[PDB]
């Protein structure tokens, strides 16, 4: 189950303290994201496992170069200039870095999290011992990483062909102490690269044979961004899947949409797996119990089936689960590889001439799956706001009671459409815009880094959408509970006033059915308004009871005493609520987290906090990883 | 390996005789393609394996319907109207079909018969799971319609592929009930009203029973049909493109090292290892790689150490495209081998239980196809330009009069046009979901629309493959002629050095030049003193005079030049003229070259061959389009393991 | 006003008998469309006006080439091979055509309509006297055009129009391999084609091959018919927004002149809509509806109605501006080099980027028009938004076996979804082409073909919209006649049963106020809104005032005796008025009477397809312009 | 709405004052000698119901698009000069015959 795999990734992300870098131990996207996001996470470069192969490779290269062997990027020019030969070994490598320090700072940069991640991947790539880089440079990299030092890197300039040439040149730039490369030390300090190395007790390196190319010729930045993108995509996917369950509960859906047999006959692994999760989440739900009751009232006048954003959520999610899982595998494969050219095969004494394409394509695919995830959340959000489709819920989830001055989540509804519209636009592909580049030497190139940044932007928006959706659903939980409490109050007042005014058994029964049947939010605004659905039904029932008993003083008395008692008792129960079925729900951890740990309450005109203040707290908890606590809680026992 | 798997799909496509439909035996995309494209392929609905469960389900549905059980789309309305109930069971079903016969025929566009017949197959197969409630008799009629080449004329557009391809499948339903306004084709010319079609094959119109209208329209059969034949073709063309990278390496004088197993072991994307393993195997004993190594040992330090990316990075480029196309095939097959219907009758448990994968994966496959096309455009571009082609003439023009021979220039122009439209097609369809059907279908997959765009992208890829293979056979010829021409030049220069009595030092320099200068730089006029053969000869003559200085030498050099301009052009013309009326013989790509040249009856293009570039590429494209191209492909890969 | 200019284009397309090709008389998108669609339209190449300059140019080029002048594509190679020189003038031109006959026929080709339009445009370019083409070749083109002869041309291959134009050249030189159509049926090799119209294959002279192939006549040809259709369909959509307002019970106030008074397209579309609705009998019903329970009904219409003029504004501008741009390209010399014989020189430039870019813009505007139509249709199908209309516009009365226009609703979403996808740009996919000598290129033909496909879909959406709207006219008219029956029945029964003035009045109100289509299925069902309302009022009257209880019970009894039969009767009568006073009468009449349709229901045997197809065919073939012009007459 | 929120001194609305200072909206209003407004009839909607932000960004976009276009046009001339182009491509009669303005 993909649910297990993702829980495994989340647990690894939180628990790891030391990333082992040795050329055999795999780095997962959870490891990359943990280093990027938790500064207590340290790298350990293991000498006993890979120092030997590195020093052998490095020395092989330096010797071969000095004896004038004809090797690409070592004694020949780069890319389109590979026909040029030199014996100025060091000068060849330094001229490479110089030509590649060619990005520009706008008024924007790759963030520190990305840059350090790239530094991690570049270090790891060296541990396979194919690069010819010196051990010392690797130790310097490990130390730069653990000391929280990183170059400031221009956003743009990589087409990610054989490598992310320009952004990786800035890491090489820091390593050789270029004065014009600026480096961050922690969050506050910025100093030239020579001052940076000095403060952590390193000296500038002079580049040897192949070292400039080894340092720039990989796809480390794209894969860095793709790794945190893929970490986040896995978590947010599991979060979206889970909340489809919560959506069913609050919308009064039919849980049958998640029956294992519907999906066993149409067996997409992601479809089966998501249905399996949903069935489990909803199994003995106290909210489904209210749903069943709701549909038994006027059964034949209510929809037999839910709308597609609920009922076909497991089929919609299926391919999205598969896309995100396969892309995680593909990115991890890239993380755990020697991306570099030439590959040094020191054992058989050849430098091998070959080559970011896997990452570029899969980031395109994931961006389309993220767009699908946002489209599902938009459609669910839209249904929840419209009283015709929310099975009892008031429009915009406005508590009112005075609806003319309470527009509830109308603002969040508008923001949802804006989020989803930009998201769909973002999901056009990047890899279809390949230009013939670098004197036509890179006549194909992956554009992985650019595609990775767009998918990263796509996830940022999904987060916004998940934040709003979860907020709306806690609003709806509160509204359903209040609804239960209100209908009970109405039934009681009607039952007792029936006894008090001494109306026949028939009249009592007819009147109590109306109290049960009328959606309370259709008349909460003014329960004794003669034109609103409570009084409208009661009047119909009264005229009906007059005809059936034919072969009035008490009915006029019942009505009069209804507008004495009803509103006040309804107000009291609401007011009391403002200062329960969620307790038996699998989604209790989410509601408790949002309401208690974040300190929110049912939205209304009498709560001074804006929607912004409420959603922000939820967004922040999503952004920083705290949401995974209620998520793991909600999920435990699923196996 | 994906190679053996694709070889298996082609073998199944060619060899299958009968498609067994029984509710357990899997239908693959080759079966769907086989049924669509080979009318001798027959559908065999096996009663013994599934008739009994169909009748149980059928009978169960009717019984529950007549008892007034409340079951979606059986005693309730459909879609956004599911809150309406009736006991008018047959009219409920006929009213659904009526309302869905709502497409328009444009100007004439329609789903093709290949797609409609495929959809018919998939709808029949779905019914064999015994969950639908449809009568066994309706299934037999479908098998008979399929086997008799009758299909409804179906409008191109109208489906959003939510729970079903509602409008298109209403036309299959409209045929089975003999709606007179539903036109049916029988074979390729004949078109008649539905009642006449049914009579011509000995069936009578059906009266719809409970749930039967819904059963006929409520799955994603048209999108899945189109996507199946799309995935079959994607698999074939992918393999073709991978194989042709090898042939590109041979004719462009690439370095085979790009495909070495260690490069890909250290970056182990499954598609990367596997495409390279194939390429390595394809180029192992190549006589063209032999010419290549020979070419780079001449003026070694004045020549690129690496090839360009379109060659050198083809395994890395291909890897994700292989994975995309292979994973999409599995996804589409999973969809083929399912009961796409709602509600599901679970007659065993006495209950009724109430097109997305294909849309997304079609979007992904369209991106992979644009990527394959980008690879082809880039290779073809290198091949056309003398700066990047390592001895080939611009546009692969044979000449020798280049001012009146533009070679494959028109093809080059068209390749740009093909690639540009292709990159445009690869924008996603799934990002354009509208809230549909009174907001009941607020998500929908658009799978049929997406599948159609991927089909169009594949149609363009076929064009590009055809031109590329054509350009590569042109390049094979030019390489073989080049080799033969250089030998004549060497021989003539060698015999004239003797006749004229030139020193060994002079002879050495003059023979070096004849070997080193690319023949196609001076072919137009071999004795033109301003072209590279003579320039190089003149340079070496000045060098030999200066080296032998410590007269009659100049006299003999002058004689050498005079006699060269008497004899060399004639001997070069003769060898070329002879060639117009070998190393390809030792090459894994002989089957392609032999297929294009002898089986399709082509020749090296020039001003003297009267056939247009159109006429040559049309033959190759018709071969790719109709599957004949898989014979050389299978011959070429014979023995790969 | 853009509305006058569009009626001007439509008039011209209908009336033109002859296309004068003379080198100064402009060709409009309407002339191109007419030549392509009406075969009685003929080309008249006017010798007296342009033969002199063509011959002067032709001779200059021939003489200069013979003298050994260094002129691109005349004594030099083409494109990236322009460093190659030759004295072999004719062979140079023939080898260019040979190399460019490089399209493939897939299973597909440019339609004859486009191919003939390209031949027209090419002929026209030649009359400017800059090409060096011979007069004889131009006369041969006119003769080919007027005799319905045209080469079969592959769909793809131009980055913009070397390959496709090479097939026109191949016809003229009688290449065996080039296939020509003659009318609808006959297909023969080019040499046979020329023979049949009494022509001989040409031997190309200096610059001739290049002159025949070196401009963008195909992209411009497709662009021209595309722009003609976009103007016509634009005006159709604008007009039908007015018909949508009538059937949906919208508020005409959205079209008031001061709101907009000022994007020209915004002012002008509003000005049209205001006029179309000024004396509408349907707006009279709308006002009446909104005065019934005013404070319980929306104050504003939804955006797809209320903001239609603002939506349409940039769409009008885009289509109008693109039209001007295509016409500029039509009335130009696209060729290179440009021979300026007057001053004894050849001019080496690049005369089609304008068309590529604007086709991308227009494809976006067409997508925009479609979204509007989708949004209106959607509203119309949903009872919550249609102001009294039944869901799916289903007549019933048995809604459980009548799904009305639901199939059309579904189709509309498919249409719109595909349309939005199409509207992505083409010009952003420029590849570095032709040995990198065409490192920019416009892709105009490809873009034009995409916009053409986008219009195809818009026609589908308009045909469905117009069908829904006539369904909606019938339902409103039936609504009004049905409400009067209920009012009469309630009224006379109140008398017969002798209820007071108070009761009669409350019951009359309910009959007036309750939306009929909420109870038509079973008017006397106690759970449906009519009897729910009457029971509320009867209880009210009992309190505010016996044997009255007797008279009410008899009222309720005689209602399920009289009511359903009389409602059934008017509907049955209707299936076997306010539209008569509406500007939109010609559309309703055209669809109902001229196309022979009727209100859709379970009792009408025609499928939705049968109905919409007729409306589509009429849109596709231009008959829709007859009602369009009738509806618009008097608008100034 | 953030502009309206400032004008009415919402504490949750932060305001910028120059480059350095960020303060809650009531303290922002205080410093410029202004007091929170109490919204009267239609003032809320009048403040939010227009397309002022889109048009604002669109305005700085169009200004820049004009400047950069002219700069691109001008730099084609510079490219001609350094690449050894033929200036004949800009001769007026070529373009008079294809008169896109």
Curated annotation (Swiss-Prot), chain B:
> What effect is documented for mutating residue 218 to A?
Abolishes the formation of the MIO cofactor and thereby abolishes enzyme activity
Biotechnological exploitation: Could be used for the stereoselective biosynthesis of beta-amino acids via amination of cinnamic acid derivatives.
- Reactions that this protein is recorded to catalyse: L-phenylalanine = L-beta-phenylalanine; L-phenylalanine = (E)-cinnamate + NH4(+)
Q: What is its main location?
A: cytoplasm
Q: Where is the active site?
A: 72
MF terms in GO: intramolecular aminotransferase activity; phenylalanine ammonia-lyase activity
Residues with 2,3-didehydroalanine (Ser) modification: 163
Pathway the protein takes part in: Alkaloid biosynthesis; taxol biosynthesis; Phenylpropanoid metabolism; trans-cinnamate biosynthesis; trans-cinnamate from L-phenylalanine: step 1/1
| Gene Ontology BP terms | alkaloid biosynthetic process; cinnamic acid biosynthetic process; L-phenylalanine catabolic process; L-phenylalanine metabolic process; paclitaxel biosynthetic process; protein homotetramerization
Q: Per the similarity annotation, which family is this?
A: Belongs to the PAL/histidase family.
Among NCBIfam families, the record links this protein to: phe_am_lyase, taxol_Phe_23mut
Could you tell me what this protein does? Phenylalanine aminomutase that catalyzes the rearrangement of L-phenylalanine to R-beta-phenylalanine. Catalyzes the first committed step in the biosynthesis of the side chain of the alkaloid taxol (paclitaxel), a widely-used compound with antitumor activity. Also has low phenylalanine ammonia-lyase activity and can catalyze the amination of trans-cinnamate.
| Name of the protein in its database record | Phenylalanine aminomutase (L-beta-phenylalanine forming)
Give the source species: Taxus chinensis
Underlying gene: pam
From Swiss-Prot, chain D:
Q: What is the effect of changing residue 49 to A?
A: Abolishes the formation of the MIO cofactor and thereby abolishes enzyme activity
How is the subunit organization of this protein annotated in UniProt? Homodimer. Homotetramer, dimer of dimers.
Q: So where does (E)-cinnamate get bound?
A: 49
Say how it is used. Could be used for the stereoselective biosynthesis of beta-amino acids via amination of cinnamic acid derivatives.
Q: Which family does it belong to?
A: Belongs to the PAL/histidase family.
Full protein: residues contained: 183 to 283 of 687
Taxonomically, the superkingdom here is Eukaryota
Which protein is depicted? Answer: Phenylalanine aminomutase (L-beta-phenylalanine forming)
Tell me what PTMs the record reports for this protein: Contains an active site 4-methylidene-imidazol-5-one (MIO), which is formed autocatalytically by cyclization and dehydration of residues Ala-Ser-Gly.
What the protein does? Phenylalanine aminomutase that catalyzes the rearrangement of L-phenylalanine to R-beta-phenylalanine. Catalyzes the first committed step in the biosynthesis of the side chain of the alkaloid taxol (paclitaxel), a widely-used compound with antitumor activity. Also has low phenylalanine ammonia-lyase activity and can catalyze the amination of trans-cinnamate.
Location(s) in or outside the cell:
Cytoplasm
């Amino acid at each position: 189950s993909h649910v297990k795999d993702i829980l495994g990734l989340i647990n690894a992300f939180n628990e790891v303290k030391k990333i082992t870098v040795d050329g055999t131990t795999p780095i997962t996207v959870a490891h990359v994201a943990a280093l990027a996001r938790r500064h207590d996470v340290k790298v350990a470069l293991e000498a006993e496992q890979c120092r030997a192969r590195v020093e052998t490779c490095s020395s092989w290269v330096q010797r071969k170069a000095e004896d004038g062997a004809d090797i690409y990027g070592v004694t020949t020019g780069f890319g389109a200039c590979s026909s040029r030969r030199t014996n100025r070994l060091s000068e060849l490598q330094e001229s490479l870095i110089r030509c590649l320090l060619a990005g520009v700072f706008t008024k924007d940069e790759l963030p520190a999290t990305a840059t350090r991640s790239a530094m991690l991947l570049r270090l790891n790539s060296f541990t396979y011992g194919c690069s010819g880089i010196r051990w010392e440079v690797m130790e310097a990299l490990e130390k730069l990483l653990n000391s929280n030092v990183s170059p400031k890197v221009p956003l743009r300039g990589s087409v990610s062909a054989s490598g992310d040439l320009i952004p990786l040149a800035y890491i090489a730039g820091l390593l050789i102490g270029k004065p014009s490369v600026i480096a961050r030390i922690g969050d506050d300090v910025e100093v030239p690269a020579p001052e940076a190395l000095s403060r952590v007790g390193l000296r500038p390196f002079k580049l040897q044979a192949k070292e400039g190319l080894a340092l720039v010729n990989g796809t480390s930045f794209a894969t860095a961004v793709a790794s945190t993108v893929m970490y986040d995509a896995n978590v947010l996917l599991l979060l979206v899947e889970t909340l489809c369950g919560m959506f069913c509960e609050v919308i009064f859906g039919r849980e049958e949409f998640a029956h294992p047999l519907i999906h066993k006959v149409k067996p997409h692994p992601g479809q089966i797996e998501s249905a399996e999760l949903l069935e489990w989440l909803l199994r003995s739900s106290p909210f489904q119990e209210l749903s069943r009751e709701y549909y038994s009232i006027d059964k034949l006048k209510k929809p037999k089936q839910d709308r597609a954003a609920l009922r076909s959520s497991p089929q919609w999610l299926a391919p999205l689960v598969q896309t995100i899982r396969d892309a995680t595998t593909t990115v991890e494969t890239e993380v755990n590889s020697a991306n570099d050219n030439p590959i040094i095969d020191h054992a058989n004494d050849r430098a091998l001439h070959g080559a970011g394409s896997a990452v570029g394509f899969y980031m395109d695919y994931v961006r389309i799956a993220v767009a699908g995830l946002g489209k599902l959340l938009f459609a669910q959000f839209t249904e929840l706001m419209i009283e015709y489709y929310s099975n009892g819920l008031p429009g915009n989830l406005s508590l009112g009671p005075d609806l003319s001055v309470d527009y509830g989540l109308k603002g969040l509804d508008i923001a949802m459409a804006a989020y989803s519209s930009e998201l769909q636009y973002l999901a056009n592909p990047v890899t279809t815009h390949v230009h013939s580049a670098e004197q036509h030497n890179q006549d194909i190139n992956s554009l992985a880094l650019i595609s990775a940044r767009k998918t990263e932007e796509a996830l940022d928006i999904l987060k916004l959408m998940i934040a709003s959706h979860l907020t709306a659903m806690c609003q709806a939980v509160d509204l359903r509970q209040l609804e239960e409490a209100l209908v009970k109050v109405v039934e009681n007042v009607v039952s007792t006033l029936a006894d008090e005014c001494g109306l026949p058994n028939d009249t009592k029964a007819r009147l109590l059915y109306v109290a049960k049947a009328v959606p309370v939010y259709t008349y909460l605004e003014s329960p004794c308004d003669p034109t609103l659905p409570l009084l409208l039904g009661l009047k119909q029932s009264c005229f009906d009871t007059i005809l059936a008993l034919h072969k009035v003083d008490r009915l006029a008395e019942f009505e009069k005493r209804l507008s004495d008692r009803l509103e006040n008792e309804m107000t009291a129960v609401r007011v009391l609520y403002e200062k329960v079925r969620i307790q038996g729900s699998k989604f209790l951890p989410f509601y408790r987290f949002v309401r208690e740990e974040l300190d929110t309450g049912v939205m209304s005109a009498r709560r001074e906090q804006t929607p912004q203040e409420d959603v922000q707290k939820v967004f922040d908890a999503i952004a920083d990883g705290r949401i995974t606590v209620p998520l793991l809680h909600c999920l435990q026992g699923f196996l």
